[PDB]
């Protein structure tokens, strides 16, 4: 079998496609013939050797994959069945998606839903699944299209792009925040009602003027701090990222004076039930047009190059990896 | 009529009980003969001139009151009716409850709930109403007694005492955090199962060991930051306070890695349906023993002295003001 393999020569990560035997695969009760994977921000860090994502080498990266079951000892899954996986430590501490074959716990798999192609599941990937979870968080908080504008940060990215399209489809007025001017036409076509510059969110008072009924944040750090200060009374922010930094230098004022909810969204260990629900919602809520707009398809050996482009913020939308 | 009056000579607030004519009260549809009020942290800030709570002088402070309607131009209220009020800006921008009479909008009043005495309504006051809103937030998040331990910070105070008593009644295992060894017996008597020192909430990593299914925070600052770092995956913190400072020096990690919810709770502008629900729940969920254990009854003339004690963290439980 072939696989993208991370090894460490002199402490610096080297990535290259290599042949290896199925016998080397980690233990698990389901074996999957992988047809598609993707590159997420976390995959890019893993591949660039940045971020301390990988604590064991050599490692097959890729926190995502979709394919067909080769063999299964889990009674929920049968040989030939179409399945997908995102998260659960896969591609971090367990051999990953960017390989022709993977062996995992059946607990980590999701049956490919009726209404979603294996290829499109990967275009969504971890990033899109996370966006769906964020949207469901706003809904849980009672945030409706009629309540006001929803703001999306890091909007041109994988999570951001998906969130814009989901919110647009669901009827919300969407404001997209982006540090790049080249992404504007793209963002408008995704459904953004207006585009705002990243520099507009540098520093804030504890409370700013109320602007947002809802927010989906991929940035963290000072951007998230300012969004919080700008939330309408009873607004909700769904936070999932740290593209701008992991710190959260905020105050309790939006919370105790404006009754704001900050809902954290984790994709790695999302419970099976909510996980299944998110995938079913994606079938319903993501327009077929999104898949053509947001995706760039690459081959396995091109991953390191794109990993680099992702870290340097030189891409927009989602990176789909054909594994075949 | 008699009322506690706040005036500032030169950037400093002066508080004294004075006699005034009823005709000096602000305009409003409902005139109430006040029988009870209370002192909350916010009232103590107002009365001591700290916290920029009052921007208009002279002011009659007191964000709570309970009494009997003398006259009403509002068709929802009638002469002789028992009513209570918390919040709505009363005691901040509108002459408030620390007086023999108050005049207010019908919208700000709550008919005295069946089963609740006027005196007990004020032992509860804003502090207890807030604790109830915090408990309801944990419930909204699906935090059940079987799910794990709930921590209450600033536990010996007004909101904290009520919170401990409510959670205890509802069947939770409760941990109380206090910076005063002298409050431990009192906290145990309210139903706290575990008592921890505030000293243990001074430094923290972005993620600490997972300890709490839920939390009710009245302190903010570092204590809140560490509580966030200690939340179980999917845990919820209901935050309502700033006794320890208004800053929130935290990181996105508990949110994006552990799916934590931080729900802000405001008592001031709580809409009528939720506000009515909270009062109904309080009547049901606070044991009779609570009113006896938590309350210290003072007269209006004692208010300034007690406001000092509150700000100096030299009181425990709830301060009840007999106005009648
Ligand atoms: N389980 C989880 O909570 C989970 C799951 C998926 C993703 N994430 C996190 O969510 C974030 C987004 O992931 P992704 O895969 O969408 O990433 P991405 O496509 O690589 O980029 C996200 C966007 O963030 C913006 N950005 C990048 N650097 C920035 C900076 N220094 N300051 C402000 N904005 C910056 C860029 O948008 P613009 O150029 O338009 O400004 C970029 O397109 C990442 O931090 C990722 O690790 C977490
Ligand atoms: N969100 C809202 O609409 C609203 C409504 C009501 C109350 N509040 C806020 O909630 C908080 C509690 O109100 P309350 O009436 O219960 O006040 P309280 O009776 O004074 O309780 C505050 C408690 O915090 C602890 N504390 C005091 N100073 C501290 C410090 N410097 N560092 C760490 N802990 C400290 C003390 O407990 P220990 O001695 O046991 O440590 C004290 O009992 C206040 O900040 C108040 O403004 C907000």
């Amino acid at each position: 079998m072939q696989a993208l393999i991370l090894e460490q020569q002199d402490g610096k990560t080297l990535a290259s496609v290599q042949h290896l035997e199925e016998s080397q695969l980690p233990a698990g009760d389901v074996t999957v013939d992988v047809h598609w994977s993707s590159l997420n921000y976390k995959d890019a860090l893993a591949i660039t050797g940045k971020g301390k994502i990988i604590r064991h080498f050599p490692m097959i990266p890729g926190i995502d994959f979709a394919g067909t079951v080769h063999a299964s000892e889990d009674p929920r899954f049968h040989a030939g069945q179409e399945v997908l996986l995102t998260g659960w430590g896969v591609g971090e501490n367990h051999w990953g998606g960017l390989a022709e074959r993977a062996r995992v716990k059946g607990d980590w798999l999701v049956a490919l839903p009726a209404g979603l192609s294996s290829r499109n599941a990967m275009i969504i990937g971890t990033a899109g699944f996370t966006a769906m979870l964020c949207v469901m968080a706003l809904e849980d908080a009672g945030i409706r299209p009629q309540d006001g504008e929803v703001v999306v940060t890091g909007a041109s990215g994988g999570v951001g792009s998906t969130a814009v399209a989901l919110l647009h489809k669901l009827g919300y007025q969407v404001a997209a925040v982006s540090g790049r001017e080249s992404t504007h036409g793209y963002l408008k076509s995704l459904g953004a009602n207006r585009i705002l510059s990243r520099d507009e969110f540098a520093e804030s008072r504890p409370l700013e003027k109320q602007l947002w009924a809802g927010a989906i944040d991929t940035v963290g750090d000072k951007v998230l701090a300012k969004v919080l200060a700008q939330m309408n009374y009873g607004g909700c922010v769904a936070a999932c990222g740290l593209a701008g930094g992991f710190a959260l230098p905020t105050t309790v004022m939006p919370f105790i004076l404006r009754n704001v909810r900050l809902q954290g969204v984790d994709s790695v260990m999302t419970p099976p039930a909510r996980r299944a629900e998110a995938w079913a919602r994606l079938v319903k809520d993501l327009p077929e047009s999104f898949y053509a707009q947001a995706a760039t398809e690459i081959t396995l050996a091109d991953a390191p190059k794109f990993a680099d482009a992702i870290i340097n913020n030189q891409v927009q939308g989602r990176t789909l990896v054909k594994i075949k």
Side-chain angles (χ1 to χ4, degrees), chain A:
Chain A
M1 86 173 216
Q2 306 205 270
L4 182 56
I5 299 176
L6 304 185
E7 293 181 82
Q8 225 175 18
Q9 180 75 25
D10 282 322
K12 291 194 300 182
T13 292
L14 301 186
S16 68
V17 179
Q18 318 185 23
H19 287 98
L20 67 85
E21 173 64 352
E22 278 80 357
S23 67
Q24 305 195 240
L25 290 167
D29 51 10
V30 188
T31 299
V32 179
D33 289 322
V34 175
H35 299 148
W36 301 99
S37 185
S38 79
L39 294 193
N40 295 275
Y41 184 77
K42 181 194 292 178
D43 294 314
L45 293 167
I47 294 170
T48 54
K50 179 181 175 188
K52 190 198 66 184
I53 297 304
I54 304 295
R55 280 80 84 112
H56 184 57
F57 298 76
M59 171 64 47
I60 293 181
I63 63 179
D64 295 344
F65 63 74
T68 57
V69 174
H70 181 69
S72 170
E73 305 305 326
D74 181 323
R76 299 166 291 192
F77 302 99
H78 64 273
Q81 179 177 357
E82 294 276 7
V83 296
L84 65 82
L85 179 150
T86 68
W88 297 113
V90 179
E92 298 179 274
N93 61 43
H94 180 108
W95 273 9
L98 299 155
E100 286 181 319
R101 180 168 290 191
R103 193 190 305 166
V104 299
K105 296 185 180 173
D107 283 343
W108 299 346
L109 290 172
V110 175
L112 182 65
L116 185 57
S117 70
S118 185
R119 181 178 190 268
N120 287 161
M122 283 311 98
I123 286 179
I124 295 169
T126 280
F129 171 68
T130 298
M132 192 63 249
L133 292 176
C134 290
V135 166
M136 294 166 79
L138 298 178
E139 290 172 342
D140 282 353
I143 307 309
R144 304 158 302 172
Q146 75 204 74
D147 295 327
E149 200 164 15
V150 175
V151 62
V152 180
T153 65
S156 75
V159 182
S161 288
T162 312
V164 174
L166 291 173
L167 290 168
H168 178 63
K169 184 273 181 179
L170 295 162
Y172 293 87
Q173 304 304 317
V174 181
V177 184
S178 174
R180 292 179 298 169
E181 314 64 39
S182 60
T183 69
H184 286 195
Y186 167 69
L187 287 173
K188 292 291 288 183
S189 77
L190 287 177
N193 298 84
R194 61 189 185 98
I195 310 293
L196 313 150
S197 190
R198 184 198 304 180
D199 55 52
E200 277 209 41
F201 301 78
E203 174 44 336
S204 54
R205 310 153 74 203
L207 294 192
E208 301 277 345
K209 174 186 172 62
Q210 301 178 51
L211 298 182
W212 316 120
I216 293 178
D217 179 72
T218 67
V219 176
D221 199 70
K222 307 190 203 68
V223 171
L224 177 54
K226 190 162 193 179
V227 171
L228 283 164
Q230 294 176 327
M231 301 306 300
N232 292 344
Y233 186 95
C236 175
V237 176
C240 70
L242 41 66
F246 74 96
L248 183 37
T250 191
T251 85
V252 298
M253 301 309 220
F255 303 98
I256 76 175
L257 293 181
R258 291 179 171 169
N259 207 87
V260 168
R261 175 185 294 181
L262 170 58
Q263 177 68 62
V265 172
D266 162 68
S267 69
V268 179
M269 292 181 294
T270 313
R274 188 164 193 77
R275 189 176 289 266
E277 176 172 3
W279 285 107
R281 287 288 305 274
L282 285 160
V283 173
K284 294 203 299 279
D285 293 336
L286 205 49
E288 186 78 28
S289 62
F290 170 83
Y291 302 110
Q293 278 179 296
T296 299
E297 183 177 334
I298 67 174
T299 60
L300 188 50
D302 282 41
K305 175 172 69 178
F306 283 76
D308 186 70
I310 289 164
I311 302 298
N312 301 131
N313 196 27
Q314 305 176 6
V315 301
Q316 69 187 27
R318 296 275 303 127
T319 301
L320 169 74
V321 182
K322 188 191 180 219
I323 301 293
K324 52 164 178 300

